Every structure is written in C-alpha cells, then in structure tokens.
Design a protein around this nucleic acid. Sequence first.
RNA 1: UUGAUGUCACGGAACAGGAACUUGAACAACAUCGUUAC
Lengths: 228, 77, 186
Amino acid sequence: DRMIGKRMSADLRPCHGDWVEDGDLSALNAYPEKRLLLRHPKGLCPACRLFGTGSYKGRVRFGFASLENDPEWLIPGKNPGDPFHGGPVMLSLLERPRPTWSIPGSDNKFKVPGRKFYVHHHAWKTIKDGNHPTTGKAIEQSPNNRTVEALAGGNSFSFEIAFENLKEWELGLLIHSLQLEKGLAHKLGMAKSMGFGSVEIDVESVRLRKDWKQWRNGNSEIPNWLGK
Amino acid sequence: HDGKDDHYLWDIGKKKKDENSVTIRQILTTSADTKELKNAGKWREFCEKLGEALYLKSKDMSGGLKITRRILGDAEF
Amino acid sequence: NPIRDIQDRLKTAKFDNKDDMMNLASSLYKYEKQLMDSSEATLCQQGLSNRPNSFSQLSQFRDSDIQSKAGGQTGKFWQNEYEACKNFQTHKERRETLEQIIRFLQNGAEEKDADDLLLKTLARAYFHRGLLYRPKGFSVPARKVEAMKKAIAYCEIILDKNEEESEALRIWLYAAMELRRCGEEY
RNA sequence: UUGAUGUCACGGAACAGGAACUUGAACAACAUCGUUAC
C-alpha cells in the first residue's frame, strides 16, 4: 500500500524532496504556499549546505581532470606505431539492480538499508582473458553487453577544486573525504562490480585568499583543520 | 532522446485509445500549408496573434498577488 | 520568521469567524510580498511541520474562499499597509512604500468586482504620491498633475454609483483644491 | 472642411535601473509464469 518513500525514517529522506502522502498536491498548483509542503521543517542537512540544492547555490566547484604522462592502455591496439589508441575488451551482461532482494518481505519490519558501497577486488584478470567471472566459460557477443576501451593502472591525472565561504571543520572534512587513509582507495567509472575502477587522490598545495591583493599559500594549516 | 515522435511538448494529446486524436505537431503541420499562409507576410501575423492569444490565456492562471509592469510617469505637458 | 507565523495562524484556524481567516490571509500575503522582492528573509528554507493536516487546512482555505471573493481579504490588508505607511519617518521610506502599494494593487481595481475600500485606498495612494515630487525646472512637474487627475478619476468611479460618501467626496475636493494652486483650472 | 493684418512646433532623443541562474557519477543481478493432486 505505501510507497518506497515511507519505508525509511523521516529524517533521512531528502530535504526539498517530494510528495508521498495520499492527497494530490496538484490542487494547490497556482499558489505560492505549495512549496512549503515539500521542505523539511528543520532546514538543510550538512550535505545540502556545501553542495547545493534547488533555490540555493552550492559553494564548491569541481573541474576537468587531464592526463599528463603517456596513455599506457590495457590491450594494445591493432595499428602499431600509434600510442594513442587501445584495444577492445568485452564485458559481461551488466543489468539492472533488484530492490526486492534487500526488502524481501512486505509488512512493516523490513526497512531500507544503507548506501551500497562496492568492494575492491581483482576480477578483471578473468575478463581480460575472455571468460565469465562466475563460471569459467567464454563470453559470447550477444546484443546486450558492451565492448569498451580501457586504461590500465599507473596513470596520473590532475584536477582542481575551488571553494568559498567554508568554515574550518567543513574544509577539514572535505580534505578527509578527498584523501583517505594510507590503505584505502576510492571507486569511479563503469562496471564497478567487476574490479574496474580504483583511484587514489593526493592533495598538492592549498592557496587561501587573504585580501584582494595577496593570496598566502596555506599549506601549514592542514594538520589543524583536519583535527578540528 | 529515442528518435521517435514522443516529445514532451510538441506531442501532447496522444493516447492509446482512438489513435486519431490530434497532437500539436499535427495541428501546426496541417496549418503550415493552407494555400493562404504560403507567402511570408501571412504566416508572420498568424504566428504573432496566435502567440498573443495563448499568452493572454496563460496570464490569469495564477492565484497570488500579481504586480504590474510599469504604471507611473505619464507626464503629458 | 515569516514561516513560523503561517503555522502559528494555521494551528488555531476556526474557518468560521472573519478574524482568523483574515489573519491567515494576511500571513500568506506577507510571505508572498516578502518573496517578490529579495530581502534577507529569503534564506529561510524550512517548511511546515504536520503535512497532511496542513494540506487539508490550506486546501479548505483556498476552496472555501472562492465563493466568498467579496474583496474582504486584500482590501483590509492594503488598508492596514497604507495606515502603517502614513506614520513613518523621513520621506524616503514613505515614497518607496507609496510606490510599492500603487504597483501592487493597481491590477485588482479594473473589474466589476471592485471594492469600495480598494478604490478608496488606491485613490488615497495616488493623491499622497502626488505631493512628493521634487521640482527641477522652475515649474511644476507634470507627474504631479496626472497623479491628481488619476485620483479624481478613481473617486469619480466610486461616486458614480452613490451620491454622498463623505470619504471619497473629501478626496475629490482635495484633488481639486490641489489642481487649483498648480496653475490649472477647476 | 479654415478665414485673413500676427503660427520659431525642423521649440521637445520614449529615455532611465535588472547575470536565464540553481540542483543531477551514462550507471547497473535475481528470477519471470500459474496451478496440480486427493
């Protein structure tokens, strides 16, 4: 009977979200008091204050990351002497995730679990050779999977993040979220459940803004913010 | 984004039943060649006054307090 | 601050007296007027607490008003707005409030359902704006003259139905006595 | 549709103020379909 929006606690639903109750809101469409029935009565969470939302601009801006060394692909291309194109690799089926396996029942006891973080492993050594990960059989060229071109491990990119009007602890937590500890790693890209995609981010110089004239490279204040 | 004839604006009015139900693309398609709107001058005023009528109908579809554009300064000396 | 007041008025709305409905309409109008211009109270990004009950009450208020659009809501709100505008300090804020009133209620006075309070306060706003015009050409500006003429036209719109009003008649005579000393004719 | 002895209207800039802006990893695993038998 209930929607999936009422299967979790009311504090973890997105602020500035949607209408899940039984009455239709379309009746109050031509009035300015409609937008007050879609926001949380307390305000904005810590993530809808750094990153933006509708009717509020976020105060952190990302950038385009560019390569610096030579590519060093995974499978060498078919045209030799051309170190700017790689070879193809065929993946597995990769279809849609079922949410009726984490919420198995139907009554009231089964809430919504957390946020589905994929694990780090090494199962691309079986894809690169042309086998399935579960069974050892070969992969057929069905009209349902993809044939991609991929980079290998050992490359180096470089990007830049601009930020304004942050507190001290917000910057400390953003740096803790950018660089992880010594043994951990992030995950981005395609086919994350097959080992593909594992990055690690290090932090180079940090430059603050004192006035409109000087800028005052602030590398000596990182061990403070983090702790704070 | 699929390439088919299902836009979110120019294809309002298309249902499964009575598939002869006209949409806005068909209406604007059969009006662009009527042997009287074939020259340049007669198509321009057609679009202009059609848009003016649709704006006049859309204006009074609110419920809050509505401000006027510019009502002051009519100095005629 | 302007969103807690809507809920304080929504808590004890009785939907029968003509005082709590007026207070609810006043709170809604003040929130909308706070949004139209960009003040510092635009950063408040909260909402209403009890969603289904408040949705029922707001839909019943916007539904049990359409049969009683007798002009009892906006007329009283702009009447109190002008009454608060009269007793101000230095002329700057008086001028700005007058032009805001004129801009906001100029539309709702162009139909057959035109209240006497709405037209009366619009004519008073035109007449009071006509006095605050700083001259710059060794002569009277024409905007003062046409403010007086517009006040006369609206007070004539009222006095066309009735004969004596004792309130609009005095505005008519004020506008005529002001047109006389500006080099014009009676 | 003017009236004569007296028209600088080529005697007068439709002018002046307002960021089409804000929010969004091209990503992905568990089934689908209903009845048989005493």
